[PDB]
UniProtKB/Swiss-Prot annotation, chains A, B:
Domain notes: The catalytic domain is sufficient for recruitment to lamellipodia but catalytic activity is not necessary.
Residue ranges of the propeptide: 1-183
Post-translational modification remark: Generation of the p10 and p18 subunits requires association with the death-inducing signaling complex (DISC), whereas additional processing is likely due to the autocatalytic activity of the activated protease. GZMB and CASP10 can be involved in these processing events.
Entry protein name: Caspase-8
Subunit structure: Heterotetramer that consists of two anti-parallel arranged heterodimers, each one formed by a 18 kDa (p18) and a 10 kDa (p10) subunit. Component of the death-induced signaling complex (DISC) composed of cell surface receptor FAS/CD95 or TNFRSF1A, adapter protein FADD and the CASP8 protease; recruitment of CASP8 to the complex is required for processing of CASP8 into the p18 and p10 subunits. Component of the AIM2 PANoptosome complex, a multiprotein complex that drives inflammatory cell death (PANoptosis). Interacts with CFLAR and PEA15. Interacts with TNFAIP8L2. Interacts with CASP8AP2. (Microbial infection) Interacts with human cytomegalovirus/HHV-5 protein vICA/UL36; this interaction inhibits CASP8 activation.
Source organism (scientific name): Homo sapiens (Human)
């Protein structure tokens, strides 16, 4: 039932969904170690092996599905409403995905086609060590930036200098994240 | 095109942007003439009537947008890069906003939440004439301080005594400004 439900969820997740889920699972599953993962079930099983997903522990799966906005799957297969996930995640300490990862992913959510192209151009202005192609989405760019150690939890300078020239909303996402690190 | 472009810039400016722009326009537009201004387009038209903004004169608008860090709008609607604005504004005599106003605004840029609360507490220690609430941002506090004539171009004592107890960076902004009024 449980395994069958996990797999069931996996059948409804597409390639974009998978890419997003793997990006959001970076605090626990290293990016190197993600490219054997070819579908959502493999990701789920990798999470199972890390005891971050089991019959009595569905929290991380729910958080993942909520973050990538698959509310339909939450309802259908996990009988969980968005209101519940909101109440749960806003409570300090319950979120298992770091605020940094969520911040980057939300930026990726807000950026359009043309804004993505602008991001690439502006980044190519700001840095030359990043290897960029035009099939890359924003997440891939983030991964490349981290690979080049110009992006990290406490290094947002280039990210902000780029985003400020694209849309104030992105910069506000960063600024908000940056200031609830008051901790 | 030009008017329609002005409105276009105006749509992207939020309440925070408006407040900042009105603060930075204080050398030309008196504070009591700013509260009929309900949006950015009204500010732009007020500038037009002072012939500080027209089709052949976009410098002040550019300086304003640059100062409040709307580089995205400069690029999108004014085809102007950060590099150009920096080169232009470092040039002696080119800036139309007084160094005093820019100094105060930069202080407002650097101050966080808790630093703002500290600012209010420390100012209430330093003075009893200022009427302060918890909805006031730092700009509003500056306006109140000027209204009470404890803050001005040649009166920074209270400002410095407060800022020294919050963060050395702020005090450095003040000191730098204060001594490049050497001439």
């Amino acid at each position: 039932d449980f395994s069958r439900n996990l797999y069931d969820i996996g059948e409804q997740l597409d390639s974009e969904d998978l890419a997003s889920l793997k990006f959001l699972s970076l605090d626990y599953i290293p990016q190197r170690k993600q490219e054997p993962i070819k579908d959502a079930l493999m990701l789920f099983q990798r999470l199972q092996e890390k005891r971050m997903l089991e019959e009595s522990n569905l929290s991380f799966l729910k958080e993942l599905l909520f973050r990538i906005n698959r509310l339909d799957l939450l309802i259908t297969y996990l009988n969980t409403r968005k209101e519940e996930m909101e109440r749960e995640l806003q409570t300090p300490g319950r979120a298992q995905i770091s605020a940094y990862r969520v911040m980057l992913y939300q930026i990726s959510e807000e950026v359009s086609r043309s804004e993505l192209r602008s991001f690439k151009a502006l980044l190519q202005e700001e840095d030359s060590k990043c290897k960029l192609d035009d099939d890359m989405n924003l997440l891939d760019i983030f991964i490349e930036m981290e690979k080049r150690v110009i992006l990290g939890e406490g290094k947002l300078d280039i990210l902000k200098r780029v985003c400020a020239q694209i849309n104030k909303s992105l910069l506000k996402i960063i600024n908000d994240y940056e200031e609830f690190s008051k901790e």
